[PDB]
Design a protein around this ligand. Structure first.
Ligand SMILES: *[C@@H]1O[C@H](CO)[C@@H](O)[C@H](O)[C@H]1NC(C)=O
Ligand SMILES: *[C@@H]1O[C@H](CO)[C@@H](O)[C@H](O)[C@H]1NC(C)=O
Ligand SMILES: [Os+3]
Ligand SMILES: [Os+3]
Ligand SMILES: [Os+3]
Ligand SMILES: [Os+3]
Ligand SMILES: [Os+3]
Ligand SMILES: [Os+3]
Lengths: 338, 54, 391
């Protein structure tokens, strides 16, 4: 129980098409992969930051860690928000993964508030319209109802089945490493491994752990980057691959896997029925959109279906073979003439 | 019976030579060791043992 | 004694059969089908699910040219874009202005959901017919479960039961079927290795956990945005996801003959089609000789209440004079009317009360109590409802 996978990994900065107002940025809350495989409507969202873990690698549910330019910084879990058209209800949070129940929307936004009060967000175009479980379009899940097979991402913190690819981060460019020393270029290492390249005859191109000086050179004619081989980062398509290593990769187990569960669906109230000669009359009173379907119990079934929205009276002919009527999630009503 | 690799020496995945605290002692070579054992079946036994300290 | 009878293939309807062994007192058996199962022989072709577009970190080569290699992966796409100048937080990622390249890589595989969320494409062969029958034998209800092939013999209370063979070999399933959870569909799905993009079977695999992956999703890599490190692409969206919302009603709702569809195993339940013969080899001990059975005489029948309906809406009181105390079988000799009770206890100069069902307004029927028959005169009246929820 002394095992901590989060000490090897780190939160990161990745590309986001909309950070707010309609402009792109290097987001600390950048969206990776939004999974909508769960039939119950639950979304499995992947983000560049890590939730429930502090910068010192210790686990704290009220804490959140994001990449603050060069080094990771701490933020509050309460400040984290998920929204489409209206705010989403967050059900589970652990590392790079968020579980949320979202209403009908065209875009998905995931944001948070840092220690300095600045709000960071990321918007992706995501068509969210969860499918109807059963034959009734209900808003709230009942405690009792018809048991239907449905899928959801389990609230459990335990990571055992699903996995993601992790690797070394690319070299982080930093112009502050280079300074103009009338009239030379000085590279201030500051205890870091720096990869440099200059358009000057003095120094060529290489890797350094020591302070370098480029005699008769301009700062604009030079490029410097910070190397990091001590941490792991998710194999993100929004972040460049490590130029030197490349194919070198690792793998880590992820929380909230998709599982086969049971969904409770409500049964619409039985309609008032009046019988006629070789026909049946039903006064349907739906509280929500309910599917009405019917078939003949003979050689020719002649299946017909309609979604009933308001108070409606339906006239259905009952043949010699019999007529089977299904009103929403209720068990089918069978009719036969005397 | 599952075995893991380190440069030219073979060791059991659950029992690495770096233990205790593999990442704390050497953070660079621990990740490098794990990167070389990804195709191997006992990778998660090595991942659990290497990232365990106190 | 082997009693051969035929009942219609309708579940929930109690049928009455008269066993008249020569020289032995008549026997009345009540038979009711609890369930009729038609299980087709299935052969799994492939499964389909939501695909996963595996896109690793793009190889951004600063001051040089990256090279694509042909990889043996499903829908493997590789493109090298020239004149690339990407940016990170601290500025430009590359030193060169026009001499940098970006290698974009992508392939298709099964998603993590495939083990849970999947549709199975099956081939349906010759179906196996089976039935669950309730028999009121010797004043007790017995359950007989047997294959409706007319060969499988089941012995309950020393009585040998042979069910079938079914008059109709009809099944609601076609040669090709698609199964998703509790729903079954008749579908002419694309063959293995011939799936089209954006349609059912865009990704094809032998089993949900197998290594083989067939993919045809039209994966095309696009040039990344100015100063941006990302892997843009054009791809036909999941054919499985699109099918889940556009599949329509399953065989449970569309099938003829009022078929109910169940899964694990895939089967047709209570299909009201044709009829089925029943062979009941009744043992010697169950029968009683006419001489050893009570003799009925001085019989009169009065019908105080009758309503012609599907349910037993008629009441009949029969006055009699029995030779001795015992058990007598009750059966209607007229096919138009059916009596609820099969056996009653006779004493002497007493009266019996029986419940009957008819469709006739003027019911003229014969009631056989043991070996003697009694005529019942009934003037049955129409009921309130023209439609009833029972056949
Ligand atoms: C999930 O499916 C498997 C069968 O493959 C089995 O463990 C179980 O019946 C299912 N569990 C639930 C909760 O539906
Ligand atoms: C036999 O079964 C029918 C239907 O369930 C029931 O009405 C009847 O009381 C049963 N009789 C005996 C003797 O078990
Ligand atoms: Os952990
Ligand atoms: Os973009
Ligand atoms: Os849609
Ligand atoms: Os609604
Ligand atoms: Os059987
Ligand atoms: Os007559």
């Amino acid at each position: 129980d002394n095992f901590n996978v989060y000490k090897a990994t780190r939160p990161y900065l990745a590309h986001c098409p909309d950070c707010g107002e309609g402009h792109s940025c290097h987001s600390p809350v950048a969206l990776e992969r939004i999974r909508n495989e769960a039939t119950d409507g639950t979304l499995k969202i992947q983000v560049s930051l890590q939730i429930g873990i502090k910068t010192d690698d210790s686990h704290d549910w009220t804490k959140l860690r994001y990449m603050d330019n060069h080094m990771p910084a701490d933020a509050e879990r309460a400040g984290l928000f998920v929204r489409t058209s209206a705010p989403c209800t967050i059900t589970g949070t652990m590392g790079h993964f968020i579980l949320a129940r979202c209403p009908k929307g065209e875009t998905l936004t995931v944001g948070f508030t840092d220690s300095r009060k600045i709000s960071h967000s990321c918007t992706h175009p995501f068509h969210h319209d969860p499918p109807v479980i059963g034959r009734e379009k209900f808003h709230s899940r009942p405690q009792h109802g018809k048991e239907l097979p449905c899928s959801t991402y389990v609230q459990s913190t335990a990571a055992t089945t699903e996995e993601i690819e992790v690797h070394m981060p690319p070299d982080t460019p930093d112009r502050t490493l280079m300074s103009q020393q009338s009239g030379n270029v000085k590279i201030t290492v500051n205890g870091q491994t720096v990869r440099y390249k200059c358009n000057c005859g003095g120094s060529n191109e290489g890797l350094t752990t020591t302070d370098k000086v480029i005699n008769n050179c301009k700062v604009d004619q030079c490029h410097a980057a910070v190397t990091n081989h001590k941490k792991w980062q998710y194999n993100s398509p929004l972040v460049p691959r490590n130029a030197e290593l490349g194919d070198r990769k690792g793998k880590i187990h992820i929380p909230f896997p998709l599982a086969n569960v049971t969904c409770r669906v409500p049964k619409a109230r039985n309609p008032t029925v009046t019988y006629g000669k070789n026909q049946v009359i039903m006064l349907l009173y739906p509280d929500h959109p309910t599917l009405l379907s019917y078939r003949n119990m003979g050689e020719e079934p002649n299946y017909q279906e309609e979604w009933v929205m308001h108070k409606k009276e339906v006239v259905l002919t009952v043949p010699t073979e019999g007529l089977e009527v299904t009103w929403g999630n209720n068990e089918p009503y069978k009719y036969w003439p005397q | 019976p599952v075995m893991c690799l380190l440069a030219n020496t073979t060791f059991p995945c659950s029992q690495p030579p770096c233990t205790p605290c593999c990442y704390e002692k050497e953070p660079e070579e621990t990740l490098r060791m794990l990167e070389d054992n990804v195709m191997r079946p006992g990778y998660y036994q090595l991942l659990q043992a290497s990232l365990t300290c106190s | 004694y082997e009693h051969v009878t035929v009942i219609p293939n309708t579940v929930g309807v109690p049928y009455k059969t008269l066993v008249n062994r020569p020289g032995y007192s008549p026997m009345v058996l009540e038979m009711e089908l609890l369930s009729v199962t038609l299980e087709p022989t299935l052969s799994l072709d492939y499964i389909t699910c939501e695909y996963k577009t595996v896109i690793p970190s793009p190889y951004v080569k600063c001051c040089g040219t990256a090279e694509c290699k042909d990889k043996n992966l499903p829908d493997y796409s590789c493109k090298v874009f020239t004149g690339v100048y990407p940016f990170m937080w601290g500025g430009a990622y590359c030193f060169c202005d026009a001499e940098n390249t970006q290698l974009s890589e992508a392939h298709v595989e099964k998603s993590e959901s495939c083990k849970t969320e999947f549709a199975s494409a099956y081939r349906a062969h010759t179906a196996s017919a089976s039935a669950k029958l309730r028999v009121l034998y010797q004043g007790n209800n017995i359950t007989v479960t047997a294959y409706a092939n007319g060969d499988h013999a089941v012995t309950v209370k020393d009585a040998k039961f042979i069910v079938g063979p079914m008059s109709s070999a009809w099944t609601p399933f076609d040669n090709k079927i698609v199964v998703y959870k509790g729903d079954v569909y008749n579908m002419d799905y694309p063959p293995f290795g011939a799936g089209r993009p954006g349609q059912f079977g865009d990704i094809q695999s032998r089993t949900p956990e197998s290594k083989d992956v067939y993919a045809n999703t039209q994966l095309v890599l696009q040039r990344p945005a100015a100063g941006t490190v990302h892997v843009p692409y054009s791809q036909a969206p999941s054919g499985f996801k699109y099918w889940l919302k556009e599949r329509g009603a399953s065989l449970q709702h569309t099938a003829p003959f009022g078929c109910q569809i169940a899964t694990n195993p895939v089967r047709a339940v209570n299909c009201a089609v044709g009829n089925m013969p029943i062979s009941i080899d009744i043992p010697e001990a169950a029968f009683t000789r006419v001489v050893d059975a009570p003799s009925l005489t001085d019989m009169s029948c009065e019908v105080p209440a009758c309503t012609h309906s599907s349910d037993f809406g008629g009441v009949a009181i029969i006055k009699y004079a029995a030779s001795k105390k015992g058990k007598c079988a009750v059966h209607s000799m007229t096919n138009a009317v059916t009596i609820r009770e099969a056996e009653i206890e006779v004493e002497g100069n007493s009266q019996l009360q029986i419940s009957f069902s008819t469709a006739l307004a003027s019911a003229e029927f014969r009631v056989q109590v043991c070996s003697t028959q009694v005529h019942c005169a009934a003037e049955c009246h129409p009921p309130k409802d023209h439609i009833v929820n029972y056949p």
